[PDB]
Amino acid sequence: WNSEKKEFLGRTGGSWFKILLFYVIFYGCLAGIFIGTIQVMLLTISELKPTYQDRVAPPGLTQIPQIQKTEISFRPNDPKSYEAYVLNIIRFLEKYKDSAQKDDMIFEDCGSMPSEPKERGEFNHERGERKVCRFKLDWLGNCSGLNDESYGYKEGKPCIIIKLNRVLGFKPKPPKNESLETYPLTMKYNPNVLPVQCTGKRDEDKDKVGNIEYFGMGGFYGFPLQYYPYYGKLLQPKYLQPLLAVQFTNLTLDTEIRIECKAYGENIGYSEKDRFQGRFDVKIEVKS
Amino acid sequence: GMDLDDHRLSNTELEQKYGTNIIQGLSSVRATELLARDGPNTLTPPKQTPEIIKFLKQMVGGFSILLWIGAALCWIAFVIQYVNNSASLDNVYLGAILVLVVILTGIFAYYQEAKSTNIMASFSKMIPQQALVIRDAEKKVISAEQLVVGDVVEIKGGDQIPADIRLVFSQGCKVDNSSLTGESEPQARSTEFTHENPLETKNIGFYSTTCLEGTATGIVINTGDRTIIGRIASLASGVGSEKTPIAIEIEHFVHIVAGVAVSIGIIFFITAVCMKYYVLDAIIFLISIIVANVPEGLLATVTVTLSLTAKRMAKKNCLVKNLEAVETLGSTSIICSDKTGTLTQNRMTVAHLWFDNQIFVADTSENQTKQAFDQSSGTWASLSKIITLCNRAEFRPGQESVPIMKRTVVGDASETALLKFSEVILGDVMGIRKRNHKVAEIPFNSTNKFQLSIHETEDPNNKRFLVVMKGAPERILEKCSTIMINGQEQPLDKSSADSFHTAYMELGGLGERVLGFCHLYLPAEQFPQSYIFDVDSVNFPTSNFCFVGLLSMIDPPRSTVPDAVSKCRSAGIKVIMVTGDHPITAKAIAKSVGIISANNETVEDIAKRRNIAVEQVNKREAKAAVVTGMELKDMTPEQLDELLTNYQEIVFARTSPQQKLIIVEGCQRQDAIVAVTGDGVNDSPALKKADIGIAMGIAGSDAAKNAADMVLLDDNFASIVTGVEEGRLIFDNLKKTIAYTLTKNIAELCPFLIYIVAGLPLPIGTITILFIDLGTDIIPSIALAYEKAESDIMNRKPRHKKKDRLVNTQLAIYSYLHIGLMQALGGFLVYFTVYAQQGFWPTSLINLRVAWETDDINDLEDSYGQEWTRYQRKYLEWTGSTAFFVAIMIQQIADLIIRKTRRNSIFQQGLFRNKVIWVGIASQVIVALILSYGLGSVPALSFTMLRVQYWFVAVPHAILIWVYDEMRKLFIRLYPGSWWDKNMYY
Ligand SMILES: *[C@@H]1O[C@H](CO)[C@@H](O)[C@H](O)[C@H]1NC(C)=O
Ligand code: ALF
Ligand SMILES: [K+]
Ligand SMILES: [K+]
C-alpha cells in the first residue's frame, strides 16, 4: 500500500470514516423505515378481530387421535399398538374434566340441551375476558365416559373424536329441514346442531364399516350452537369447543376401511382440494 | 517458407543452386522428384471447426456452469424422491425448466459469436490455373500446381503469374503488385538488380499478380504457401481473431456474478449443515440460491439488443458480420488505416493547375467544374485544347447514365485523369477531338517520356495545322521557346526559367505527378494542308515550341474522409496511417485529411527548414513522424513502442502486408483497442488481427471484405464517427441493463436466505422467481437498450481497455447492496402484511416453516386462536409468494426508471421521452396481471389471486427507491469528483 498518500485498501483513513458513516446511516435509516412501515401496517390489524377471514372461511374438521397419515391400525392383543393413539386422546381430553372446569369466574354452565348461540361480547377492550361454556366429559358416552372401558377408549372397535376447527366470530347455521338429509332421521332438532354423520367413502365397498354410533350433547349428533361464537384465545380462556365422539364397532377385521365424516350446514362448505375442510378421511384396520 | 530471397545471384549462379538450365528447363524427372520433397503448388485451405462442436461449445457459456449444477441437483433431489414418495413434485419440472433455459440461452449465444473465415473465396479468383513452363527443352502448358522451385516459366502479357518467379529474360514487362501494395500503378520489371529487398527488385515476379504487358522468362523461386500471397493467406486465415473486446467484458462479468453466487452458496450451505439440516435440505437450498443469483435472461436479451442494432446499423449502410462488432467500434483507441480506397478515392484525378506562373485548385471529389477557370481565358482556352487533343485514352461505352468521374476508362493512369478533367470541364471532348481531326500520329515508348500529335483544326475558315505535345516537365522547357500569356505568345525569359523549376519542385513535393503541355501552330507557308508528316521523325520539329500550361494529379481523398477523421481525432482517438504507397504521396495525403496538423513538422520538414543534418536534430520536437516500411525492418519492437508512445501523428509507408500486422500488434500491446480500415489483399492479415476490421464495400478486395467485421456498403468513411457514437452508447446502455437485472437478484435471494435461517414460510417459490427473470423483465431489459447518454460521449476520451471495465465494484455493490436490499425490504413488508391480515402476525411466524410444511397438522393455531387446515396454509403460502413477486416488480418499475439515467434526474432525460421503457413498464404490469390476479393463477404454478390492495403495498418502497437514487444523482451532478462522484457513481 503506497506509503505515499495513505490509500490502504484503496482509501485513506478520513475517507474510511466517511464511507463507514455513510453505510451505517444508509442501512440504519433503511432498517428504520422497514420496521417503521411494519409498525404502521400492524396498527391496522386489531388484536381482537382478523382483518380478513378468507382462508378459514370454510371451517375445517380434525380427528382427535391426531393420526400420523390419516390411518389407525392396531392390535387389540398388543397394548403398544394403540398406545400412542389413546395417549393422544387422553392428552387432549385432560382439559374437559369437571376438575378443570372449576372456576365460575371464567367458566359458566350452559344448558345440557342445545341452545341459541350465546353472543357474549362485542370485540372491544371492555369488560375484560369472557366466560366460556362448559362441556362435560360424560356426554362422550362409552368413550371417555370416565369409566365403562373409558380408559380403553374402545380398544376393540375404536372410537374417535370429531372436532370443528375454531373460527373467530363464527356462528354456524345448520341446514334447513328441506328434505331428508340421509337415512330417515327421526332426529330433527334442526336449529342448534351441526349434523356430523360419518360415512363410508367407498360406495362399491358394501360399507363393511358396520355400526357407527355418535355420542353428542343430550344425545344429539352435532355441535351445540350455544358455544359458538369464538372470541379468540385472549378474550376466552381455554375455550372448551364442542366435541363429538364416534364409536365404530365394525363387523370387518384385518380389512382397511376408508370413511369420510362430513359436516352438513348451509354455512359450512367443503372442497375437493381440501380433504380436511368440511370432511374427514380415516383409514381404520383392526388387525388380529 | 523462406523470405530470404535470391535476386543478387546471376543466372549462372542460381542455375547451380536450383539444379536447372535456363534454356533447357528442368527434366520432368527432377520435376517429379522435387515435387515430392516440396509438395504441390497450392495454398492449403484453413481449418474451420465443425459447427456442431461450436454449438455444443456454447453449452458451457458461463452461466451454464451454474445452471448445469442446478438441474443436476434438481434431479438428484428427485432421485431421493424415489426413496420417499412425493406425488405433487416440482423437482422434475424445475430441473426440466432449467435445462430448457440452458439450451435456450445457448442457441442465442451461438449466433452472437459468429466467425466468417471464408478467406480462400477471394484468393481463388487471382490464382492462375495454367502456367507456360518449359521442361526438358519441350514447350508444354501445364497446371500451375505441378510447378516446383527452379523450373523455367514463360510469363506472357495479360496472364497471371504462375508462381513466385525470378525473371532472367524480359522484354517490356509490366506487372500489377496491388495485391501487395494496394495500387494498380503498374510496376515494370527488368531482368536485373534494382533494390536490396525483394519487394520491388524489378527482377522478380510475384504469385498471382497479373501480368499487364510484355513477355518474361523466369525461374520459380518459391511455390505454394511460401509465396508472398501464400504468406498473406496463412496470416489472414490462420491468425483468426477469435478474441473480441466486447465479450471479454461480459465474460469477466459472468465470472464475478458466478463468483458471488458460489461464495454465498457455500456460506449458506455450511451454515445449513451447522443448523442440523440433512444434505438433501441444504442442496434444495443451493438450487434456490443459484436460481436467485444467476441473471437468467440477461445474456439472452443482450444478443437481442446487439442484433437489433446490428440490423439497424445495416440499414444505414454499416454491415456487421459479427454481432459483437457493433460495440468493438468505439471504446477503440487507435485507428490504423489504409490510404488508397479507404482514405483515398483510388481514382487518379487532377488537383493543381499552374499556368501564367500562377497556381490553381480544381475539383477533386465527385464534384464538377470547381476552379478559377476564368483568369486568363486565353491561356486556359488553348490549354483545354492541348488537354483534350493529346490523349489516347477513351471512355468505355454505355456510360450515358453514369457520372463523369464515376466512369469506366480504357487507358493509362495519367491520361485518364486528364480525360476525366476535360470531361467535367468541356462537355464532350470526343466532339472536339473528332472535329480537330488528328492527321499525324506518334508512337509512345517508355524511354520516350513525351507524346505528340498534329491536328488540322476544323475551324470553318482557318484550317491551319496545330501540333500539341505533352510529356514530362523536364523535357518541356528544354524544347520550348515562346510561352503564352492571355492569347499573346510572349517569348520566355530568365525569370520564368528558374520560376518554372521552383514552382514545379514545390508542386511535386506534395506527391503530385506533374505533366507539362506545349503546342505550336505551324505556319501555312512551309506546311500547307497537303503536306504529310512521316512517322519516322523526318517531317516535324521537336524543339522551340510554345509552353501552354502545367498540371498535376494526386488521387484525392474521399469527399468526407477529412471531416470524419477530424471528428475521430476530436473524440480522443489516435489515428495512424499504414499503406504501401511512397512517403511523398503519403505525407501529403496525411496532412490533407486531418492526420497531420499544419504546424507539426516531421524530422524531414525541420531538417529542411533549419538546413542542418537530420542526425544532428533530435526526435521529440517533431510531433509528427513518417516511418518508411524499410526502416521498420531494422526497427526493434522496443522502439516501435518508443515511437508509438512519443508521437501521436504517425504514418507508415511502403509497408509490407506483414508489417501491417506488426504495427497493429504493436498498438495492441499498448492496451489499445484497434480498428483497421482496408480495401485490399495487403490489408487482410492485419484486418483479422484488429479487435475490429472495417472494409470498403465496392472499392475493397474480397479478401479484406471476408476478413472484416464491418463492411461499409457505400465506401462512406462517415459511418465510422456514428459507429463510434453508437458503440459507446451501446456500452453505457449495457451497463444499465446489467445493473437492472443484478439488483433484482438480491430481492429474489433474501426470501430463501431468511427461510433457511429464520424458518418463516417460503416468501417466494423458486419456480416463481423464474417468472420474474424470464417474463416480466425481458421487455424492460430490452427497453433500457434504447436509452440516450446524459452527456455527449465525444466530449470524452475512449475507455481504457483494462482501467474502466463493463462491470466494476461500484456498479456491483450499488446493485447488490444498495437497491437489492431496499427491494427485498419492500417485498418482506408485503409478505408480513399478507400474513398479518389473515391472523399470522409478524412476531408469531418464526420457526413455523416446520409445522407449516407438516401435512398431518390440520389445526394449526394462529395469533387469534383460529385453527388452520394444511391446504389453507398452503394457499396462503402461495399468496405470500405472489405478494412478494408482485412487490419486487412494482419496485422494478421504479428500478427501470432509475436505471434509464446513470448521471442526472429522470426529468432531464424525461420519463416520457423513451416510449419503449413505458412498453416495459406496461409489459411488467400486464404480465403480473395475466399471472396472479387473474386466470392462470387460480390453481397453478405457486400462484394465487391477490387482493387488489396487495398490488399497491409496494408503492411506498418504490417511491423511496427512486427518491434515494435521484438524490445521489443530484449530488454527483452538484459536486463532481469530491467523494460522492467517486463512491456513488454507477
Ligand atoms: C354404550 O352406552 C349405552 C348407554 O345406555 C350402554 O347401554 C351400552 O351398553 C354402552 N356400550 C357398551 C359396550 O358398554
Ligand atoms: F492504401 Al492500400 F491497399 F488501399 F495500401
Ligand atoms: K435470477
Ligand atoms: K477482426
Numbering used by the authors:
A (entry chain B): 17 to 304
B (entry chain A): 51 to 1036
Authors' text:
Here we study primary-active transport via P-type ATPases using functional and structural analyses to demonstrate that four simultaneous residue substitutions transform the non-gastric H+/K+ pump, a strict H+-dependent electroneutral P-type ATPase, into a bona fide Na+-dependent electrogenic Na+/K+ pump. While the sodium pump is electrogenic, generating an electric current as it extrudes three Na+ and imports two K+ per ATP hydrolyzed (black ions), the gHKA and ngHKA export H+ and import K+ in an electroneutral fashion (cyan ions). The exquisite ion selectivity and stoichiometry characteristics of these pumps are determined by their ion-binding sites, formed between transmembrane helixes TM4-TM8 of the catalytic subunit.
We co-expressed the rat ngHKA α subunit with the rat NKA β1 subunit in the HEK293S GnT1- cell line (see “Methods”). Purified proteins were crystallized in the presence of the phosphate analog AlF4, and either K+ or its congener Rb+. The anomalous difference Fourier map calculated with the Rb+-bound crystal shows a unique strong peak overlapping the density at site II, unambiguously identifying this density as a bound K+. Thus, the distinct cation-binding-site structures suggest that the ngHKA has evolved to produce smaller reductions in extracellular pH, as suggested by the higher pH observed in epithelia expressing this pump. This may reflect that the main physiological role of the ngHKA is to reabsorb K+5 instead of building H+ gradients. In the (K+)E2-Pi state of ngHKA, Asp945 forms a salt bridge with Arg949 (an interaction also observed in gHKA’s equivalent residues).
